[PDB]
RNA sequence: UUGGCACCUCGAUGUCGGCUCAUCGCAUCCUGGGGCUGUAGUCGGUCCCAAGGGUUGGGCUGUUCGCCCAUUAAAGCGGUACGCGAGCUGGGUUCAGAACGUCGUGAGACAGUUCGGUCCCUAUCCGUCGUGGGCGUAGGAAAUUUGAGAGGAGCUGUCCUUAGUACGAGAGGACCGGGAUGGACAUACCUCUGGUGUACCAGUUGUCGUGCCAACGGCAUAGCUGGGUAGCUAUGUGUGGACGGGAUAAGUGCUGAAAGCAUCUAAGCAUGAAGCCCCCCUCAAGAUGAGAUUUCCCAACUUCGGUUAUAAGAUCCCUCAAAGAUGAUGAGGUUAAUAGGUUCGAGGUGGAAGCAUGGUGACAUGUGGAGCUGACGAAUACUAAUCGAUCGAAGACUUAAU
């Protein structure tokens, strides 16, 4: 079981051995370091905490997340590492295989590895029931005054209320999503890029977490 | 459509908890010492960033 | 880009009027949103002036309004001529940043953020 | 993308000229058919003296579509028209001649006789 | 350019053996076709009606009339499936996309050689 | 269901069907597990367990029904004010017009028919879907988290092989097991195929301007037309319901007496479903039971009660977008690439203007893949993120241990 953190760059295509067009997503997974190792003894569970992407060192009057705060700088320093923008825990990996301050390389994954990619999906803002919940529209003509409305939200005196889980307009997207059983097409060590077959959630520049597929 | 019951003074006033205006984001102008809006030209002396506007 | 609460034709027309006015006066008081849009339009006009070629003059003529500026000498110069003369000459050695916006604060009528946009 | 009520030209000498799609076979709620899919159809226009008559309910295989098909290599083939061939239960054509080009996807479907008869397989 | 990482990873995919062509040109595309076990080259000859995209994602569309039926083949430019491309003729056209040809036939559909 | 009764409602509880959105029961339509069979096999019949998921499109009719066409694994039956009109429709029915048949002397009338015929409402409360602020969580903070709980998902076809084997006179033709590939559905995403693309490029009509020519601008749906970037998108591209574990149902037993036999049950011990609890995905410590880990901050005053601004930190304000109704979130704020500009590209368009040349001319060709170009890549402090201000600890008691 392996895990790495990367940023989504975009999509492209690669030609397979038989000349099949393979839709791919380019992920850059440079600057991964094991910040901390969590153990059952101390934390009650085993995990490695990986910090990805170096951030600038602490300064006195930092006004942004670009510069590490004193708490963050200390945590990273314990691992003898530079402060990191993104930090995530991998429970799947074996703690013994890793040492604190160790670099996690893209070469950990190899071509043909089946992986699960986790990321936050693209935000869509306030969205109606048709787009958010894939509901059918009402008639567009024939006297209709019902087009993009959600429909009846209940029954009558029996229940005299709307049940929890009724599908209504609200904020859509910006949700954690895991796409399972994706494949590593290629690993570029020089550019620190992993090529994942298919597409993964979130905008370009978004954080992606790549893990060995849970289902095998 | 219409209110079934009148709103009590208590309920109305609870609703008005967040109905308020904040103090303007103002700082003392360095040149004249009168308060000015931050990132705005000082109206009193007509100076911004140590230069007359 | 900003819609500025106008339709496409109205938006384009107002931006031409604003750009020409800024070129003539060299400083104008307007709303922040309009100023933020106009800075792009004017600077692209300055770019054309700095190139100075006939094609650039014709490209600038598409945007600039036909107005007459009365000089102290009493000579009359069109906005296009001022752009391709004095304004272009001033900013020859400067690369971008031909305008600045200074916030003035809200106005009484609608609370709109008044700003001054000026060349330099 | 052929659906219910789609009219297709018939690319054969079976005696049917135009058919209308009664059904797309291959599952409940199945909406569309493309090249290689079998459809149930009624004959709307028939050439006189042909074997197949107007108003006959028959089965046909789709040979060309405007939608076209995408191949695994990322290549596409699209046709100017939507065409079908009236077929027997064995998948053999009712008519003796196939008219116009057919997609190679018919070979996958095991419509070998049609593929053989077709002037060009692309 | 495009994102530099995308260009770096897909640079190997690009083919440098391909000839230069424009929409309106007549191309003889030699396509590697597998029928059962057997593999052979089948030539599709037609006018290029469209070229779009960039890098490894670039595609082109060739149009031919077969037995009175228009057929369009869209190909990825850098697909290994194309053995070779030959430019038979260079055509005079006034636009990048020749969609108007789809509704034309015979003399109306003719394109003048450069 | 048709009724009976007349108990809430006549200072109004809108009524058929459809549409939208569902939700529940199981007397189960399909799929899963069984028993018996007048069960050879393949198919069936009947009964038991089982509600996890699934349960199509048309013709006719206002229809509900129902019949029919074509499918499907199946086209389940019921409740929810015959669910749902402050969500929609308004064809039927149930106003005023008119007509037919019929009845009436007549005015008129008819669960007979025919044609036509106004569906209002800015959401207060609960409820529901989203999204913030306060305080708490015995110091003040930054990150990473455990998961009590809760939600989601849960469906199936066909084909190949085992095997023309079992079975069977033949016809026909298994199980069990192993593969492959679909339908429907869900979800993420725009590389591809397409859609849109009102500050992209080009062609073109009428008319009015920039004095005229040339070149341009206004108006005509964006005047119209052909393309089209980013973004947003489906019909496009990936992925999923896998493999399993534990306990069970109807069942099937092993051992076994009461009851010397027998007996699956009483003691004891196994096996056994798409179902149950997990496994998978998502939320989640206001889980007031407020959890854990790592790191940061740690002083003076004092009436000795405690206070104080400051620390770490975080905001105001400002430049913004991957975020967004607003908040919020995230990228930045000069010790700076946050945006604009500028410069260089990608993609798009398709050959600018000017000049020259050929033609009587409309035009053509060359200069020259030209010129132009929103959102995309990179670089560059030229412009703007100024100067500032505000908030924010000093850690209660008891007991035990050390
Ligand atoms: Mg609909
Ligand atoms: Mg409407
Ligand atoms: Mg009584
Ligand atoms: Mg009342
Ligand atoms: Mg039962
Ligand atoms: Mg009802
Ligand atoms: Mg109602
Ligand atoms: Mg009516
Ligand atoms: Mg009556
Ligand atoms: Mg794109
Ligand atoms: Mg005009
Ligand atoms: Mg003219
Ligand atoms: Mg007018
Ligand atoms: Zn001042």
Distance, C-alpha A212 to centroid of its chain:
14
CA atoms within 13 A on the CB side of D20: 9
Task: Say how far apart CA A128 and CA B10 lie, in whole Å.
Answer: 35
Ligand 3 centroid to A167 CA: how many Å?
Answer: 48
Confirm if E41 and E31 have CB atoms less than 8 A apart: yes
Residue D35: name the closest of D116, D115, D119, D117 by CA: D115
Residues 6+ apart with CB under 8 A from E108: none
**In chain C, what are the domain boundaries?**
2-120
A 10 A CB-CB count for E17 gives 8
Residue A205: name the closest of A70, A77, A26 by CA: A26
D·E CB contacts under 8 A: 55
Q: Which residues on D lie below 8 Å from A13 (Cβ)?
A: 74
Task: Say how far apart CA D71 and CA D9 lie, in whole Å.
Answer: 24
- Minimal C-alpha gap between D117 and chain E (Å): 14
Confirm if A28 and A193 have CB atoms less than 8 A apart: yes
A·D CB contacts under 8 A: 10
Confirm if C16 and C65 have CB atoms less than 8 A apart: yes
Q: What method was applied to determine this entry?
A: cryo-EM
Q: A20 to chain D: nearest residue by CA?
A: D73
Residue A208: name the closest of A176, A186, A173 by CA: A176
Parallel, antiparallel or unpaired: strands D7-10 and D83-86:
parallel
Confirm if C16 and C34 have CB atoms less than 8 A apart: no
Per the structure, how many domains does chain B have? 1
CA atoms within 13 A on the CB side of D57: 3
A182 phi/psi in degrees, rounded to 5: -85, 170
Q: What is the DSSP string of chain D?
A: -B-TT-EEEE-BSSSEEEEEEEEE-SSTT---B-TT-EEEEEEEEE-TT-SS-TT-EEEEEEEE-SS-EE-TTS-EEEESS-EEEEB-TTS-BSSS-B-S-B-THHHHHT-HHHHHHSS-B-
E95 CA vs F363 C1’ separation (Å): 19
Task: Say how far apart CA C2 and CA C33 lie, in whole Å.
Answer: 8
Confirm if D19 and D48 have CB atoms less than 8 A apart: no
**In chain E, what are the domain boundaries?**
1-109
Range A124-141 burial, b when 16+ CB lie within 10 A, else e: eeeeebeebeeeeeeeee
A158 CA vs F28 C1’ separation (Å): 26
Range D58-86 burial, b when 16+ CB lie within 10 A, else e: bbbbbbbbebbbebebbbbbbbbebbbbb
Residues 6+ apart with CB under 8 A from C49: C56, C60, C83, C84, C87, C88
A 10 A CB-CB count for E32 gives 15
Confirm if A109 and A4 have CB atoms less than 8 A apart: yes
**In chain A, what are the domain boundaries?**
1-215
A177 CA vs F149 C1’ separation (Å): 22
Distances (CA, A) of E106 to D52, E65, E66, E70, E103: 32, 10, 12, 11, 11
Task: Say how far apart CA D13 and CA D96 lie, in whole Å.
Answer: 6
- Joined together, the tokens standing for residue E72 give 């369009």
Task: Say how far apart CA D35 and CA C74 lie, in whole Å.
Answer: 79
Residue A176: name the closest of A141, A193, A200 by CA: A200
Q: Do A19 and E13 touch (CB under 8 A)?
A: no
Per the structure, how many domains does chain D have? 1
Distance, C-alpha C63 to centroid of its chain:
10
Q: Is D26 on the interface with E (CB under 8 A)?
A: no
Q: Return the CATH superfamily for domain C2-120.
A: Ribosomal protein L17 (3.90.1030.10)
Q: In this structure, is the dihedral angle defined by the CA atoms of residues C17, C18, C23 and C29, taken in order, positive or negative?
A: positive
- Record the resolution, in angstroms: 2.2
From residues 5-64 of C, list those within 7 angstroms of strand F by Cβ: 8-9, 11-13, 15, 32, 36-37, 39-41, 43-44, 46-47, 54-56, 58-59, 61-62
Task: List alpha helices for chain A, DSSP H.
Answer: 70-78, 129-133
A 10 A CB-CB count for E51 gives 16
Task: Say how far apart CA B26 and CA B34 lie, in whole Å.
Answer: 10
Confirm if A47 and A100 have CB atoms less than 8 A apart: no
Q: Which residues on A lie below 8 Å from E9 (Cβ)?
A: 12, 26, 186, 188, 191, 193, 195
Distance, C-alpha C58 to centroid of its chain:
17
- Joined together, the tokens standing for residue A67 give 């510069």
Nearest nt to the CA of A8 via C1' is F322
- Joined together, the tokens standing for residue B13 give 């006033």
Give, to the nearest 10 degrees, the angle between helix C32-51 and helix C8-25: 70
- A45 by DSSP, 3-state: which? coil
């Amino acid at each position: 079981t392996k895990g790495i953190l990367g940023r989504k760059i975009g999509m492209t295509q690669v030609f397979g051995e038989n000349g099949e067009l393979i839709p791919v997503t380019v992920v850059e997974a440079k600057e991964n370091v094991v910040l901390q190792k969590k153990t059952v003894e101390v934390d009650g569970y085993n995990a490695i905490q990986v910090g990805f992407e170096d951030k600038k060192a602490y300064k006195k009057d930092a006004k942004s997340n670009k510069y590490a705060n004193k708490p963050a700088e200390g945590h990273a320093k314990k691992a003898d590492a530079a402060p990191k923008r993104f930090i995530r825990e991998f429970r799947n990996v074996d703690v013994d295989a890793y040492e604190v301050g160790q670099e996690v390389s893209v070469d950990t994954f190899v071509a043909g590895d089946v992986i699960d990619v986790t990321g936050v999906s693209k935000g869509k803002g306030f969205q109606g029931a048709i787009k958010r919940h894939g509901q059918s529209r009402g008639p567009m003509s024939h006297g209709s005054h019902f087009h993009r409305a959600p429909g009846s939200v209940g029954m009558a005196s029996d229940a005299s209320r709307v049940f929890k889980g009724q599908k209504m307009p609200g904020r859509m997207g910006g949700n954690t999503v895991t796409v399972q059983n994706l494949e590593v097409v290629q690993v570029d060590t020089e550019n620190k890029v992993i090529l994942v077959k298919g597409n993964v959630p979130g905008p370009k520049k978004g954080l992606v977490e790549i893990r060995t597929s849970i289902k095998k | 459509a219409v209110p079934k019951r009148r709103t009590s003074k208590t309920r109305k006033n609870k609703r008005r908890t967040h109905f308020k205006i904040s103090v303007p984001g103002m700082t003392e102008c360095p040149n004249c010492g009168e308060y000015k809006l931050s990132h705005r030209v000082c109206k009193n002396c007509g100076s911004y960033n140590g230069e007359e506007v | 880009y900003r819609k500025l609460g106008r339709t496409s034709d109205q938006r384009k027309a107002m931006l031409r009027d604003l750009a020409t006015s800024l070129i003539i006066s060299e400083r104008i008081e307007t709303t922040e949103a309009r100023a933020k849009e106009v800075r792009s339009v004017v600077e692209k006009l300055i770019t054309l002036g700095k190139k100075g070629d006939l094609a650039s003059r014709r490209n600038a003529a598409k945007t600039l309004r036909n107005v007459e500026i009365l000089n102290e000498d009493e000579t009359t110069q069109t906005a296009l001529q001022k752009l391709f003369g004095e304004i272009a000459e001033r900013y020859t050695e400067r690369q971008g940043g031909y305008t600045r916006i200074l916030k003035q604060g809200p106005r009484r009528g609608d609370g709109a953020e008044s700003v001054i946009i000026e060349l330099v | 993308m052929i659906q219910q009520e789609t009219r297709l030209k018939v690319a054969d000498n079976s005696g049917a000229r135009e058919v209308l799609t009664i059904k797309v076979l291959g599952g409940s709620g199945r909406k569309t058919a493309n090249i290689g899919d079998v459809i149930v159809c009624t004959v709307k226009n028939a050439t006189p003296g042909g074997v197949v008559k107007k108003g006959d309910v028959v089965k046909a295989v789709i040979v060309r579509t405007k939608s076209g098909v995408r191949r695994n290599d990322g290549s596409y083939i699209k046709f100017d028209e939507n065409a079908c061939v009236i077929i027997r239960d064995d998948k053999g054509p009712r008519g003796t001649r196939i008219f116009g080009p057919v997609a190679r996807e018919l070979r996958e479907g095991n419509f070998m006789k049609i593929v053989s008869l077709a002037p060009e397989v692309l | 350019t495009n994102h530099k990482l995308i260009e770096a990873v897909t640079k190997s995919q690009l083919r440098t053996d391909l000839p230069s062509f424009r929409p309106g040109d007549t191309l003889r595309v030699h396509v590697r076709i597998i029928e059962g076990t057997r593999e052979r080259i089948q030539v599709f000859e037609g006018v290029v009606i469209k070229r779009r995209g960039g890098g490894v994602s670039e595609t082109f569309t060739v149009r031919k009339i077969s037995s009175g039926v228009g057929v369009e083949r869209t190909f990825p430019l850098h697909t290994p499936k194309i053995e070779k491309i030959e430019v038979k003729r260079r055509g005079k056209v006034r636009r990048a996309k020749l969609y108007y040809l789809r509704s034309l036939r015979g003399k109306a559909a003719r394109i003048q050689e450069i």
